From a paper:
Zinc is essential for virulence and survival and is acquired solely by the ABC transporter, AdcCB, and two Zn2+-specific cluster A-I SBPs, AdcA and AdcAII, in S. pneumoniae. Although both SBPs share this structural core, AdcA also has a C-terminal domain (residues 322 to 501; here termed AdcAC) that is structurally related to ZinT, a periplasmic protein from E. coli and Salmonella. The AdcAC domain is linked to the N-terminal cluster A-I domain of AdcA (residues 1 to 311, henceforth referred to as AdcAN) by an 11-amino-acid linking region. Collectively, our data show that the AdcAN domain is necessary and sufficient for Zn2+ acquisition, with the AdcAC domain and the His-rich loop aiding in Zn2+ recruitment during growth under Zn2+-restricted conditions.
The AdcAN domain has a two-lobed organization, with the N- and C-terminal (α/β)4 lobes bisected by a cleft in which the metal binds. The binding site in AdcAN is comprised of three Nε2 atoms from His63, His140, and His204 and one Oε2 atom from Glu279. These four residues bind a single Zn2+ ion via 4-coordinate geometry, with bond distances of 1.98 to 2.08 Å. Intriguingly, the AdcAN domain was observed in a conformation that partially exposed the metal-binding site to bulk solvent, with the relative solvent accessibility of the metal-binding residues (His63 > His140 > His204 ≈ Glu279) remaining the same during the five independent MD simulations. The partial opening of the Zn2+-binding site of the AdcAN domain arises from the α7β6 loop having moved away from the binding site due to rigid-body rotational movements of α7 in a plane perpendicular to the helical hinge interlobe helix α5. This conformation was also observed for the truncated AdcA variant that lacked AdcAC, AdcAN (residues 27 to 309). The high-resolution crystal structure of Zn2+-bound truncated AdcAN did not reveal any conformational differences by comparison with the N-terminal domain of the full-length, wild-type protein. Metal binding was restricted to Zn2+ ions, with differential scanning fluorimetry (DSF) showing that other divalent first-row transition metal ions did not induce stabilization of the N-terminal domain. In the AdcAN domain, the metal-binding site is located beneath the surface of the protein and is largely preformed in the absence of ligand. This permits the bioinorganic chemistry of the site to be tightly defined and likely aids in achieving selectivity for Zn2+ over other metal ions.
Author numbering: 27 to 119, 136 to 309
The structure:
Amino acid sequence: GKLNIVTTFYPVYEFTKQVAGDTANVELLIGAGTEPHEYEPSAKAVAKIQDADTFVYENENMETWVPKLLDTLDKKKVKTIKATGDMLLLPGGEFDPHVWLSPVRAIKLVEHIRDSLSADYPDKKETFEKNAAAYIEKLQSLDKAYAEGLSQAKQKSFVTQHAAFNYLALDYGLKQVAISGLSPDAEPSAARLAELTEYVKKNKIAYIYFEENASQALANTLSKEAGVKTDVLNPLESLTEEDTKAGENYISVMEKNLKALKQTTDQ
Ligand SMILES: [Zn+2]
């Protein structure tokens, strides 16, 4: 019947479902409201993976538990796919795994998933290739929107609370500045607030981007004390249940990210 495929977190799920389409029941292991950077599967989740037909993960530098799991899998039926393949990676903040925030790299991940599924299930190669080709067409339009909207950036540097955008920066000619010690929910101390205010002023920072909407308390404090606005650059590591309700997907969230980023890069 239908292939049973287990994927780790949202972009791996989305790219795999786009390629597999109706040939497969694609399960999302790390769902909405859980952090993929900290997740590790329980024994029952591990058993689910081992008896799947296919398991897709993004990269061992993201799902750092996958290397230990791979050693058990030769006595198990599941065939595995590393979505990033042999893509070379940037150094970590020990390599940076966040390649899917660059549309041109997302195309490469889709192509690799297509080719791996095609090699594992030759009788479905026609379907994998036609599903992948239609989605890659959509990713190419996203890539063009990014290239057109960011290539003439007057302001090349952008400040983010989650450092997921180094490949976006590399591939589209920008500079990610990561800031730690802020959470979308935090109320920073007076001393922390003063550090941010000095940085914001001496570098003319217009926005701080968060992985989800800053709390109304944090946004008001940053405006009144630091003179900086806030917005969202979503690393697409897990959709909120809100976003899942509204039908957001990789491309729509990437379009929202572009719009938010241009508030900085267009000056
Ligand atoms: Zn991340």
